[PDB]
């Protein structure tokens, strides 16, 4: 039928309206799954490994490394959050969120023969507007030990349990106002994570120290 | 599963995986579908597995013919094969407004609301608008110009413009020829019949019938002009006794006594035949045709042709009411006691030899309340969708004619009903308006598919359709050549009142129904 | 990220050997490939120098022709869009009777020219919409061009000549003595009423001699031989019978009853006797000539030699009622003795072998009767087979020209002519549509540059020509191919002539058939099926 | 050689003990599972796929249980039970499976604490006794002459099917074809709906048009098309018998060695229909059915009586025009009496409903048979109403034959497990304990309506619960709709006291038959 | 040679066309008269042809010879026809026929 | 109408090997079974006898 097929029999082709289907159809699987790990009151993962090794997991790149899929669309967006894992490390499960409700609503208008060049001009000044008010509506102000706990509980809520959540909250804001120096950047590598494997969940803790 | 952990070979969708694999179904359904509605369609091929070319453009059809396995798929086929039977036509739209309900459905299911709700908004839109329905519809007169029109718009659709010009006078001709007054119209009294000889624009009507079988003697006469018809289904070859009896001779002699006698029951017959022949035309101008839906032994076709007599045999079941009503016999199932007032008359009877196939013209009756319909063309594609163009036709102007009242096309009456239905909106008490709204969105998917075939913009086009129908309150439709509304009434395009109402009834029942479904099982195994 | 879902909807429904191909380049560049294959595969046998084609069918029936109905026939044609075009062909066949190979190749140009005109930007309605208008101009322009008419049907010299052009198409070298003997044949029938049978000339095919030795008989000619011990007759009085020549017998159970010694001593001498009555009734009535369709009896056949009567069985239904039709009798369904005015009569009936074949002869005396046959002889089968389709494409032409008596000229001239014309109609129209109308004139060059491919010229030298002198003014010069380098010259003084119906009919039949495939927009090709094939073709 | 010595064939597999009653329970809980979600006035349809190309679309209990196919022999019996409910009283299909799951749940509890399943079986036996006598206690009269009350009675038997939106229409023609088929002969009542009430569904047209005929409506046709398609006020005669020239039963021959014994033959066959036509004649009749051919020369004697005949008609099609319109089948026209004669039917018309004809022997006066037409989308659509209108027959005949209400939404397992645990509280025994367990486990009924109306169980459960310890409480149930608690008594929800009766002994049996049950052995031959 | 989704013919058809087929063809002929030169003259020579059977034919006769070969090549079946034809017609000089059509080929 | 598909989305994308269990009855009652039978299967070795 088409062109690829006639010079390579055996090639996998989807072409017009079919690709779009197939990516947005993707996407919207991504999003189907990862919708319940968003908040504080999302739902806990058990992801088996092929090995048997049990991990519970509710972060938004962990789970989508350990999803066993296999779909072209689905690793674009895969290496998207790795990279925003990377780099702010957090925001993965609100990233593919926003990639697959940003595919529906275009969808939506370009079921009804909308090119999809006249929405990609529409995001792109959505996003240079959006971009604009996020700069006028954000908090500058000097950040004590107490709006550091408050991010510390704002990201540790969503990924443990309340009284976890708040033990790591003191020790993680702890450590970096210890290994923090006065207008230098922070380098992480000086904080040591070690696990120990004998005591509850709730006795980590922080040495100001070496172990 | 439950069902998988007492069936292991189980296959099951639960929850949103049902509404998800329906919904996709019944998209694909649609999309398939949508370059068939309107003039400005596009033909598609069918091949069978042994190789059969079939041209179509009808939804049914088509339906049939696409290589389909999907449950939802056979509930939408089987919605359009009752639609198609009942009323004729309407089977792409009904397939289009399913897809599409279900999808604006699915528009606010996604958004975590019950189908439930959506459920009620249908059944409320879908009262209102039978209500408006009935306020729209234009109870006129059914002269000739109006079935003309109603023909044009159906048949326009199937097949090419000038194909479709001939076969709407050829159908409205047909149509009102069998008609009685105030009586229900038997569409059988029609007989479609295949030639593959000539032009497809020369089809045309034969006022009488055509029969696909001709005289078996040679010596037989051609063509007749005057000719006394004989509806009769009379055995008129030997027949054996029915208690296994046999013969039994001593002498040469005594066989040929018994081979003369045991001729002598149907030569009675043969005999009365020739002579109600002979009392009703002494002369040989006139002419007698003799037609049997039993068959005709050589020795009997020899004797009625050695008397000017034509025979044909093994007619169709139905010709004989066909004939009855056309040339104005009596149709006789013996020849016990006959008389001349139970002759059918017909001004002309030839016979037209095609190829190895012979046919039976019997024409120039007085008043056939029963005709013929003679489709020609180069190829057997050809006749087949000149055969569907055809039944289209013939049941759109019968639904005309039934209906005292007719409803304008083009779409306008969808945009009029989604607006009526939006002003409704908040009247319904609940969230129930979503699915009214979806509902009104699902009825203006015939202007937009519309306009799409017709090659412009959906959005535009139907926005300024609506704000003309919402300035001037008229029906207004698509132009297919401008894109601009115009008044499908002054044109003169028109829908079926039934086909409308059968679409609303028979769309929001099964897009209520596929809605409620949460669970697909295949376990019978 | 290793392999690409089908998409969701129809690609996922679809069944498991079902195709589907949509829109222009997947379906409809598509059909115009197929179709132009179709068309480039038959191109070679168009013309008088049109090469024979050997194909073997699935049934390792060996053909060897250049008929172009013939080779699509015997072609296993698989593409749906060739398929139609095959169609097309067939309905011109049927129709007219030659023709055929214009069709094709009328529609493959039509079809490749679609393609270019689409490629440039035009839409498939526009092409339908312009190639219709053309066609209607070319339907009004052809009587303009007719340049002479039959005018005599009767006389063998003119009707030889008129068929000479249809029959030398096929078989190129020896033209015109197949044209007098089918001349000769046709207009032995063809009585006073202006209705020709096509079906009355009858052609028997006896090998060994070559076919020049091949004759025409005012009569038919059975490939069989006599059953009894007279094998010939001066003054047949023959008389059919479609009963087996034997005593009838009850049609519902026949069983001799014998109670005493008598009855069981003389039944056989009183059957023998019956049948002895009955056959000396036959031959009292003075008909020397029995022809039955059924099975002889012994007795019969003794009583039949002892009265010196010619017996002939014939199989067919078929050939009982073309004997009946060229003697003039009448099947007697039982076996009584024909009265005078239902005995058939021929000047002569006799047995003889032609070659090595033992054949029965109802022979006439006059140039007349209700069928004629032509006895044709050669080296090969295959040769006279397709001596055979030359004499049914000749018979064809006559019909035609019975049913229609004007003659257009051919070898080309009459489509430059309507080419140069439909040009000249579209310059002068406006819109997208004169784009559609100059491609449907110049897909008529499609005749004269494969007839001078076929003949060994450069073929557009020759177009060059056929225009200027069109241009000068005469309409009547086509292709000259007894020549080695391009030369055109005037037809109606050289004799080549095509009938009217023939290319109205062609050019009508390859129009809608280009048009029917344009049409199509998608395909959806079910699984093929191995079945024992399809009950309605038995 | 020396193949190996056992006792017992090969391919038996035999297993014992605990893990088969946890087995058998959780066989059962799976089965309850399946259709656990269609209980309810918000019961969402599930689409089953026929073994052999069809679709049930449908949401009644029996018939997904019917439609599906299991392995484990305790899946079995429970689809059996939903079978002998279907069949018995009509409805309470999904809802008996669901009792019968929730009663082995909570046995299973006591069979894992050291408890014999002879106790509690005597315990559940002793609640099913109590059950009954509190229904009996708790039910209301009705009487059948209130054709408003059965007309609600209807209503609220088909409120939780697919049909309500037309429930006004489906509950007139379900009463009036249960009406008309009510007969009594020799003193014997007799509602027999599965022969006499036929319900016919063809295409097309709208559900608004289905109603039920005062008659008879088959598909066929004319025999000769110069007889009349409608005739005003006919007289039916009725015939199981050819009229045609048939073989006898002996071994005959004929001998001919005349000359016109073949056609005098042939004449006598002849004479002997013309006879036989000339009998049926003879009683002046207008229209002859027959279940059996009708030769050519039969049709046309009868035509020259101006006669209608309908050729080749189903026995159970003839035995209800029978009923309808009076006559009586008889075989040999020669003993065709005046009162065989069927006179009542008001009109027979035989009219094109899409490309087919079909025959009306409507209007006549005093039927005892019916057709119901059913008018509508497709197939499927068509076949789920007839599966309603079959529920909604069965409970107004059971209604009809038992006048009795109980509460329904619930009400009625509220009441009846307060009383057996107010019962309970006397007991001293161990026994208790199941009886206690079984008659809260009566309280799934409720619990699953709240959670298909998506409200919350617990504290809406709670509430009810704690409503049914006072004293004028019996008739409170919840809403399927809004999900809150209602008194019965306003709602106007009522069932069939028959049907909760059979609903609680089924359950109650089907638990005490598997409870029973250990050491299933399997894979023997016949 | 393109792959050419929906092909034109039955899949498996052979196709050969130019002059290569016609000096194919004329090798074919000349094989086949080969297979009955030396059984010419006064000093022609016999022939044993064994069919499947074990059945032998011995035999001097053009005809006979070119019929108990199952020849299926199409361009050499002529000669065989055209001997058959000189047997019919004639009777003598079928060996004569293959061997001047061979040599007019050649 | 003799086959179920797979649902779009991540029922489709799922390896061939895999198994997704998702709600409550798929995932917590059987984890539930599966604990309560191991603790079954333990049972008989507890205390002194
Ligand atoms: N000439 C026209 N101009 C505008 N609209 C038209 C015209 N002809 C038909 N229509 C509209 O297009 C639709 C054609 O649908 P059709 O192809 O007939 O589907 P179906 O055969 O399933 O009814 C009709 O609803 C009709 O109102
Ligand atoms: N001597 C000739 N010179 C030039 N053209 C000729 C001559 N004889 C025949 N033709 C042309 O050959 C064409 C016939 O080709 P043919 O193989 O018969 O195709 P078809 O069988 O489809 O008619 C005619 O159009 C005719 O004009
Ligand atoms: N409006 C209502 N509100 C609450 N419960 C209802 C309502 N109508 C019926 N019910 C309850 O629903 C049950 C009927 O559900 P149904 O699906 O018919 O079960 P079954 O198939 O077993 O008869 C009855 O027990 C009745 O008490
Ligand atoms: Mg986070
Ligand atoms: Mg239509
Ligand atoms: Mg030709
Ligand atoms: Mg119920
Ligand atoms: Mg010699």
Same mark, same amino acid.
């Given at each position: ?42 739902? $806990? ?15 938004? @790149? ?89 991010? &510390? ?59 | ?27 694909? *359904? ?132 000038? /194909? ?147 025979? *044909? ?177 002054? !044109? ?34 | ?73 015997? /072609? ?295 069928? =004629? ?16 389709? &030359? ?63 076929? =003949? ?17 003014? @005469? ?64 | ?114 408890? %014999?399943?002879? !106790? ?29 009350? $059965? ?157 209608? &005949? ?19 089948? !008889? ?53 789920? #109403? ?8 069965? #409970? ?55 959670? @298909? ?14 409503? %049914? ?58 | ?83 058959? =034809? ?21």
């Amino acid at each position: 039928m088409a062109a690829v097929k006639t010079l390579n029999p055996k090639a996998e082709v989807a072409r017009a309206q079919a690709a779009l289907a197939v990516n947005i159809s993707a996407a919207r699987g991504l999003q189907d799954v990862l919708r319940t790990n968003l908040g504080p009151k999302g739902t $806990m993962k058990m992801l088996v490994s092929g090995a048997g090794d049990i991990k519970l997991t509710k972060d938004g @790149n962990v789970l989508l490394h350990e999803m066993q899929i296999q779909h072209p669309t689905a690793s674009l967006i895969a290496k998207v959050a790795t990279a925003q894992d990377d780099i702010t490390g957090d925001g993965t499960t609100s990233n593919v969120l926003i990639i697959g409700e940003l595919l529906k609503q275009a969808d939506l208008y370009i079921s009804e023969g909308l090119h999809p060049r006249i929405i990609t001009e529409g995001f792109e000044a959505a996003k240079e507007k959006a971009l604009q008010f996020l700069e006028e509506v954000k908090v500058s102000r000097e950040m004590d030990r107490e709006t550091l706990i408050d991010v &510390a509980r704002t990201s540790l809520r969503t990924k443990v349990h309340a009284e976890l959540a708040d033990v790591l909250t003191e020790a993680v804001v702890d450590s970096i106002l210890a290994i923090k120096k006065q207008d230098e950047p922070i380098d992480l590598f000086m904080i040591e994570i070690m696990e120990m494997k004998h005591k509850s969940e709730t006795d980590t803790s922080l040495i100001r120290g070496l172990v | 599963a439950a069902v998988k952990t007492l069936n292991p070979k189980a296959e099951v969708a639960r929850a949103q995986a049902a509404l998800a694999v329906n919904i996709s179904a019944a998209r694909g *359904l649609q999309d398939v579908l949508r370059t068939n509605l309107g003039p400005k369609g596009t033909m598609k091929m069918l091949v069978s597995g042994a190789g059969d070319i079939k041209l179509t453009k009808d939804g049914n059809v088509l339906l049939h013919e696409m290589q389909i396995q999907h449950p939802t798929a056979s509930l939408i086929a089987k919605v359009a094969t009752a639609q198609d039977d009942i009323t004729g036509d309407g089977t792409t739209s009904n397939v289009l407004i399913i897809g599409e309900l279900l999808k604006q459905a699915d528009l606010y299911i996604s958004e975590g609301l019950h189908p439930r709700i959506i459920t009620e908004g249908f059944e409320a839109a879908k009262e209102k608008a039978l209500q408006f329905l009935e306020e729209v519809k234009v109870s006129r007169e059914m002269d000739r110009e109006t079935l003309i029109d109603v023909a044009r718009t159906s048949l326009r659709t199937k097949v090419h413009a000038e /194909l479709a010009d001939v076969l709407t006078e050829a159908v409205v001709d047909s149509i009102l020829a069998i008609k009685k007054q105030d009586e229900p119209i038997d569409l059988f009294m029609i007989e479609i019949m295949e030639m593959k000889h000539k032009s497809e624009t020369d089809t045309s009507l034969i006022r009488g019938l055509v029969l696909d079988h001709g005289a078996r003697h040679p010596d037989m006469k051609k063509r007749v002009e005057d000719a006394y018809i004989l509806t009769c289904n009379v055995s008129l070859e030997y027949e054996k006794t029915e208690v296994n009896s046999g013969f039994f001779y001593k002498s040469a002699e005594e066989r040929e006594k018994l081979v003369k006698a045991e001729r002598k029951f149907i030569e009675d017959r043969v005999k009365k035949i020739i002579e109600l022949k002979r009392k009703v035309c002494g002369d040989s101008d006139k002419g007698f045709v003799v037609i049997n839906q039993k068959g005709i032994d050589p020795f009997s076709l020899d004797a009625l042709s050695k008397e000017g007599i034509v025979a *044909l045999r093994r007619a169709k079941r139905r010709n004989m009411e066909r004939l009855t009503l056309a040339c104005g016999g009596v149709a006789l199932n013996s020849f016990d006691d006959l008389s001349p007032d139970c002759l059918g008359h017909a001004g002309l009877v030839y016979e037209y030899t095609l190829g190895e196939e012979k046919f039976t013209f019997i024409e120039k009756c007085n008043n056939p309340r029963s005709v013929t319909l003679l489709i020609k063309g180069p190829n057997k594609h050809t006749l087949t969708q000149i055969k569907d163009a055809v039944r289209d036709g013939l049941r759109a102007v019968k639904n005309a004619i039934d209906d005292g009242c007719v409803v304008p096309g083009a779409g306008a009456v969808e945009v009029a009903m989604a607006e009526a239905l939006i002003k409704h909106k908040p009247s319904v008490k609940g969230r129930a308006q979503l699915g009214v709204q979806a509902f009104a969105d699902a009825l203006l998917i015939i202007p937009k598919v519309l306009a799409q075939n017709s090659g412009f913009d959906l959005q535009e086009t139907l926005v300024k359709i609506q704000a003309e129908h919402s300035e001037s309150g008229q029906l207004v439709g698509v132009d297919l050549n401008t894109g601009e509304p115009m008044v499908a009434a002054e !044109v003169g395009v028109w829908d079926n009142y039934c086909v409308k109402k059968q679409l609303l009834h028979s769309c929001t029942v099964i897009a209520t129904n596929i809605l409620l479904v949460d669970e697909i099982m295949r376990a019978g195994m | 990220a290793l392999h690409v879902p089908k998409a969701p909807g129809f690609a996922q429904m679809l069944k498991e050997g079902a195709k589907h191909f949509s829109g222009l380049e997947e379906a409809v560049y598509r059909n115009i490939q197929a179709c132009k294959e179709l068309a480039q595969t038959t191109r070679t046998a168009y013309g008088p120098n049109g090469m024979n084609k050997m194909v073997i069918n699935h049934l390792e029936k060996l053909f060897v022709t250049n008929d172009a109905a013939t080779i699509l026939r015997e /072609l296993e044609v698989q593409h749906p869009a060739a398929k139609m075009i095959v169609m097309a062909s067939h309905m011109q066949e049927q129709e007219v009777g030659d023709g055929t190979n214009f069709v094709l190749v009328f529609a493959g140009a039509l079809l490749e020219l679609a393609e270019e005109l689409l490629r440039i930007g035009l839409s498939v309605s526009e092409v339908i919409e312009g190639y219709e208008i053309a066609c209607r101009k070319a339907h009004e322009i052809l009587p303009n061009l007719v340049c002479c008419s039959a005018k005599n049907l009767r006389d063998i010299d003119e009707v030889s000549s008129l068929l000479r052009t249809s029959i030398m198409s096929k078989q190129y070298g020896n033209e015109v003595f197949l044209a007098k003997l089918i001349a000769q044949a046709c207009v032995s029938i063809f009585p006073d009423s202006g209705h020709f049978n096509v079906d009355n000339i009858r052609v028997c095919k006896i090998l060994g001699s070559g076919i020049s030795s091949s004759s025409v008989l005012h009569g038919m000619v059975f490939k069989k031989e006599t059953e009894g011990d007279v094998t010939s007759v001066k003054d047949a009085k023959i008389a059919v019978y479609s009963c087996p020549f034997d005593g009838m017998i009850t049609e519902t159970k026949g069983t001799v009853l014998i109670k005493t010694a008598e009855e069981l001593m003389n039944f056989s001498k009183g059957e023998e006797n019956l049948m002895d009555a009955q056959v000396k009734a036959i031959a009292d009535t003075g008909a020397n000539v029995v022809v039955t369709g059924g099975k002889v009896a012994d007795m019969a056949l003794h009583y039949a030699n002892k009265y010196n009567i010619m017996l002939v069985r014939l199989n067919s239904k078929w050939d009982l009622r073309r004997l009946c039709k060229t003697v003039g009798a009448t099947a007697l369904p039982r076996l009584t003795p024909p009265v005078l005015e239902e005995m058939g009569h021929c000047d002569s009936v006799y047995l003889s072998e032609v070659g090595d074949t033992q054949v029965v002869v109802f022979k006439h005396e006059k140039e007349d009767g209700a069928i =004629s046959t032509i006895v044709l002889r050669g080296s090969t089968d295959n040769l006279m087979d397709d001596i055979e389709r &030359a004499v049914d494409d000749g018979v064809n032409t006559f019909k035609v020209l019975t049913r229609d008596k004007r003659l257009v000229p051919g070898g080309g001239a009459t489509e430059i002519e309507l080419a140069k014309q439909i040009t000249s109609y579209g310059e002068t129209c406006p819109g997208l549509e004169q784009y559609a109308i100059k491609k449907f004139a110049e897909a008529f060059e499609a005749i004269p540059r494969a007839l001078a491919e076929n =003949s060994g010229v450069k073929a557009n030298e020759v177009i060059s020509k056929l225009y200027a002198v069109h241009q000068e003014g @005469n309409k009547n010069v086509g292709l000259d191919i007894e020549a080695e380098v391009p030369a055109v010259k005037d037809m109606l003084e050289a004799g080549i002539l095509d009938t009217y119906l023939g290319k109205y009919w062609a050019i009508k039949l390859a129009t809608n058939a280009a048009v029917t495939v344009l049409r199509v927009d998608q395909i959806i090709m079910a699984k093929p099926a191995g079945g024992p094939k399809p009950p309605s073709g038995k | 050689g020396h193949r190996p010595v056992l006792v017992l064939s090969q391919n038996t597999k035999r297993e014992s003990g605990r893990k088969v009653q946890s087995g058998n329970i959780n066989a059962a809980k799976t089965i309850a599972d399946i259709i656990r979600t269609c209980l309810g006035p918000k019961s969402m349809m599930k689409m089953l796929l026929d073994p052999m190309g069809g679709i049930v679309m449908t949401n009644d209990g029996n018939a997904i249980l019917r439609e599906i196919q299991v392995q484990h022999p305790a899946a079995k019996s429970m689809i059996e039970i939903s079978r002998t409910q279907d069949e018995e009283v009509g409805d309470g299909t999904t809802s008996v499976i669901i009792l019968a799951g929730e009663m082995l749940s909570v046995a299973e509890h006591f069979l894992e604490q050291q408890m %014999h399943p002879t !106790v509690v079986i005597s315990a559940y036996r002793k609640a099913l006794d109590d059950m009954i006598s509190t229904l009996k206690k708790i039910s209301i009269p009705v009487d059948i002459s209130d054709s408003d009350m $059965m007309l609600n009675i209807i209503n609220s038997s088909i409120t939780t099917k697919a049909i309500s939106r037309w429930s006004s229409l489906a509950c007139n023609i379900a009463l009036d074809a249960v009406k008309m088929v009510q007969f009594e002969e020799n003193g014997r009542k007799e509602i027999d709906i599965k022969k006499y009430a036929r319900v016919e569904k063809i295409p097309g047209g709208i559900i608004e048009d289905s109603c039920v005929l005062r008659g008879v409506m088959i598909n066929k046709d004319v025999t000769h098309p110069r007889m009349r398609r409608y005739i005003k006020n006919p007289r039916i005669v009725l015939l199981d018998s050819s009229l045609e020239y048939k073989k006898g039963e002996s071994q005959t021959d004929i001998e001919i060695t005349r000359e016109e014994d073949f056609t005098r033959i042939l004449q006598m066959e002849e004479e002997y229909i013309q006879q036989l036509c000339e009998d049926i004649i003879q009683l002046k009749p207008d229209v002859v059915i027959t279940e059996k051919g009708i030769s050519d020369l039969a049709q046309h004697y009868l035509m020259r009586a101006n006669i209608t &005949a309908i050729r080749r008609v189903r026995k159970t099609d003839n035995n209800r025009i029978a009923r309808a319109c009076g006559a009586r089948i !008889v075989s040999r026209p020669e003993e065709l009496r005046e009162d065989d004669v069927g006179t009542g039917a008001g009109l027979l018309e035989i009219k094109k409903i899409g490309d087919e004809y079909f025959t009306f022997i409507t209007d006549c006066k005093d039927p005892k048979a019916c057709t119901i037409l059913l008018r509508g989308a497709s197939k499927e659509i068509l076949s789920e #109403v007839e599966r309603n209108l079959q529920d909604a027959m069965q #409970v107004c005949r059971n209604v009809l034959l038992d006048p009795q209400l109980v509460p329904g939404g619930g009400a009625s397992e509220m009441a009846v497990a307060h009383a057996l645990t107010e019962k309970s509280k006397a007991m001293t025994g161990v026994e208790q304990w199941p009886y206690r367990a079984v008659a809260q486990a009566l309280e799934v009924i409720p619990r699953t309506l709240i959670q @298909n109306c998506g409200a919350s169980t617990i504290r809406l459960l709670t509430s009810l619960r704690a409503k %049914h310890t006072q004293e004028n409480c019996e008739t409170w149930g919840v809403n399927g709709e809004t999900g809150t608690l209602v008194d019965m008594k306003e709602l106007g929800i009522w069932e069939p006291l028959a049907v909760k009766l059979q609903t609680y002994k089924t359950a109650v049996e089907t638990a005490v038959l598997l409870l029973r049950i250990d050491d299933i052995v399997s894979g023997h031959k016949k | 040679m393109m792959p050419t989704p929906v092909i034109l013919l039955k899949e498996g058809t052979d196709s050969s066309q130019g002059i290569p087929q016609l000096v194919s063809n004329i090798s074919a002929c000349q094989v086949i008269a080969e297979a009955v030169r030396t059984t010419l003259g006064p000093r022609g020579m016999d022939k044993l042809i064994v069919d499947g059977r074990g059945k032998a034919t011995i035999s001097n006769d053009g005809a006979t010879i070119l019929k108990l070969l199952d020849v299926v090549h199409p361009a050499a079946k002529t000669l065989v026809d055209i001997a058959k =034809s000189q047997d019919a017609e004639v009777g003598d000089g079928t060996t004569s026929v293959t061997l001047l059509a061979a040599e007019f080929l050649k």
